[PDB]
């Protein structure tokens, strides 16, 4: 559970960063 | 010593439930044996 | 136990303002001088027309008395005297009894543990039931008994073990608990009370003449069905000339019933 949760948080960070990189 | 040390897995949980039903069944079968022997033993003593 | 400091000091100024309301309400004339002296330190802050903010600053400043345990004990003693003096409403008690009962409470360890408070709670249940009571034999009996109890409490206080008061609690609370269909038991209990009192006329002048007549009528009305003969019913009807409920009226009803029990 902890590994899957930390992966999911890194993905959300990468998605947010990828949208910010469009600016 | 205090445990069998099968390694933690869903297999081992199944095997330990099966071993528990085995041992509990063995207890019940041997409890019937002990009761039947105890009855005859007390009958013979009176005879 | 604990509170936020603003809560704690708010409760202090509350209890001061409440002690003042209780003191004014128990005594609108300032007759209870020894009692008033034991609250002068809190009463001054309400007799002076201070705003809630100004007394709150004085509480935070330690100028007001501000121990909530002392205020709660002191407030409790006062309101439990207020409950006594308010409970006996139709029979205002003497000032010497009030200051005597106050001293007995002040001397006691804890009023919530005291039998004083238990007696007042038993009176409160009995009295509160009467406030909305519909006309029925049990309710009229309890009104009468409670009025006697209020009078005797105003004559002897709560801390005195007057056997009559103690029995009047036991009998009153039993009749209150007794189920409303239990008419024969209600009659029997009320009869047993009048039989056990020293007075030939325990209710005389205790309650309105209409209520005295209702008690007499009620005792007559549940006796009449026991009489098989119209002549005996007419002898019992002739007793209805009475207005005050008396032990002698009860004995007269019983004599007429016993005469019919012979005449069958």
């Amino acid at each position: 559970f902890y590994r899957l949760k930390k992966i999911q948080e890194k993905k959300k960070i990468i998605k947010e960063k990828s949208e910010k990189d469009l600016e | 010593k205090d445990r069998i040390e099968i390694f933690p897995s869903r297999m081992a949980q199944t095997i330990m439930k099966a071993r528990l039903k085995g041992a509990q069944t063995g207890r019940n079968l041997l409890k019937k044996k002990s009761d039947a022997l105890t009855l005859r033993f007390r009958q013979i003593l009176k005879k | 136990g604990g509170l936020t400091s603003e809560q704690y000091h708010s409760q202090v100024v509350g209890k001061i303002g409440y002690i003042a309301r209780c003191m004014q309400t128990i005594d609108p004339e300032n007759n209870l001088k020894k009692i008033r002296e034991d609250y002068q330190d809190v009463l001054i802050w309400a007799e002076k027309n201070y705003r809630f903010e100004e007394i709150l600053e004085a509480s935070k400043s330690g100028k007001c008395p501000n121990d909530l345990d002392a205020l709660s004990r002191r407030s409790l003693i006062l309101q439990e005297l207020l409950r006594l003096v308010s409970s006996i409403s139709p029979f205002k008690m003497k000032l010497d009894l009030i200051e005597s009962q106050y001293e007995k409470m002040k001397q006691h360890v804890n009023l919530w543990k005291s039998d004083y408070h238990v007696k007042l709670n038993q009176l409160n249940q009995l009295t509160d039931y009467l406030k909305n009571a519909a006309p029925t034999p049990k309710n009229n009996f309890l009104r009468a008994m409670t009025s006697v109890l209020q009078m005797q409490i105003a004559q002897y206080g709560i801390t005195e073990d007057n056997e009559g008061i103690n029995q009047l609690f036991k009998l009153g609370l039993h009749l209150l608990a007794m189920a409303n269909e239990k008419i024969d038991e209600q009659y029997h209990l009320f009869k047993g009370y009048v039989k056990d009192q020293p007075e030939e006329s325990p209710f005389e002048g205790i309650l309105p003449a209409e209520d005295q007549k209702i008690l007499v009528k009620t005792m007559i009305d549940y006796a009449m069905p026991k009489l098989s003969s119209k002549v005996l019913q007419d002898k019992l009807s002739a007793l209805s000339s009475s207005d005050v409920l008396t032990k002698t009226l009860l004995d007269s009803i019983d004599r007429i019933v016993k005469e019919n029990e012979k005449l069958n």
Binding site: - | - | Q11, G14, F52, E53, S75, Q79, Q125, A177
Partner: protein
Amino acid sequence: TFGYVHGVSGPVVTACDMAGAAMYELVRVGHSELVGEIIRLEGDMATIQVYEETSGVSVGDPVLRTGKPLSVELGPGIMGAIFDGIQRPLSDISSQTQSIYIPRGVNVSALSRDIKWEFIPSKNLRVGSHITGGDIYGIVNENSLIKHKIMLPPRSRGSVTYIAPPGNYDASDVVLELEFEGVKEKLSMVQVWPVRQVRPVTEKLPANHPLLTGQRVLDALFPCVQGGTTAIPGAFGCGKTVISQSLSKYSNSDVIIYVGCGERGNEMSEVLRDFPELTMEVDGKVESIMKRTALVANTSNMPVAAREASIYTGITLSEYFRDMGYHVSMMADSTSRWAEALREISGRLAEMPADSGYPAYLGARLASFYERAGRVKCLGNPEREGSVSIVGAVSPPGGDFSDPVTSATLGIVQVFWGLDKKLAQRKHFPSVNWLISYSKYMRALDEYYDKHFTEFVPLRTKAKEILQEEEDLAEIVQLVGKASLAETDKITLEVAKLIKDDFLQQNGYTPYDRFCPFYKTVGMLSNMISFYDMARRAVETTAQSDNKITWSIIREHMGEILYKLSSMKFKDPVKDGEAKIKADYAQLLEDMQNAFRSLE
């Protein structure tokens, strides 16, 4: 005022323009006003855990804030109500909608408006009078039993600028107006309180008086105090109703609150069907127990947050009645179902699991709930005492107490009435297993028993010993038979049989055992243990003699006293006066003393 929905994923609704919003604030989402709590803030945006199914919520939908966290409306009109776990009124939803369903996004005001209640202002108050939180500014006659003490909210204070005269007023009429620091507060009978906040007190007192259940085992051997924390292993096979109905009909608490924590649909309707039909004798009138209770019912498909909140709602109600100076009893009929709802919230918040998959804070969420029990001196000036007693059932799977909700509950509750399927199968009602069960309040109740029942502490101690000796002696009986025991031990099994068969058992369907007063309970146990002591003295006095007393001699020469010791259960406080009952008990003491004196 309102924000707008920015995104939705399952029950999670992200909203925007929420810059004014607060953590755990309560928000209505969508055109249907679906309930939810803000679980995060991230700028001018808020993430709302919507309780109800979000299907149909749209981006750009309104998101209306309530100015409050999850909170209970408190006031008159609680008695007889049925609530869901978030205080929505299930009876009034039914009567207004005329539907078998709760509509998604109910907005029905929890206390019914438009009912003009009969109000009497507290006759001591005046314009310019000082007032503090918990002051009773008037009384509302909402029902015959429960005179509803309206009180100033705990955080409000100041000078009374106005109080309404005697009359009829509904919950939205301004009954009080007060001022502090030059700011006016207008105030209603309805009072709003944050459900996860403890209603404050003057002081939590030590608990010192029995919560009489009217049930011999529960009152004699395992007493719960007024203010006590207790649990029951509520499961079908054990007959859980024997406690909860007895408490509801008879017990010495002025008000009761039920929480359906998250119960099976049909088991919920049993509670809701049954309680309206139950009755109490008060002052010789008979009235429905719904005059003194509210049922916070929740079926298992009620929203997760409503199940998790339901326990906190019931205690927040119970604390308001406690602050009115009433003794509440609160039943919580499966703390396990509440702990599942709590586990589901944690799972949806994507929090890490702890013991058996429950959240880390399960221990704290249980402990901070049971600490809301106890006796108190209320806030505000009429110095009144009150309490909440919490009777929170547990449901350990297979009876295994190592289950973390059960283990943490038994780590906190001071009393545990261990009901058992083995006793219920034998119809040994009230079915409490006396070996499993316990109470920690015995010490604290010594003051009460010393004042009112001074012989009873000895009798209770002797009873527990006689029962423990029965279980120890039963091993010897199983090994070598009853014939092999000492005479003392044989009479110990006979008295333990009387205690187990006619003291601790109580068939509540019979007219004589509907309830059992504490004096009847003491008198019964006093006679059984008086017989035990006299029989034991007769045996021990004839030890090593030629002629020797034994159970068979006692049964031969005084089997009538054994018959009476059983028969005493049939005495009826309704038909028999207390003096008659006490006199029969005193006569059996004299009869047994003469009977033993004829032997030794």
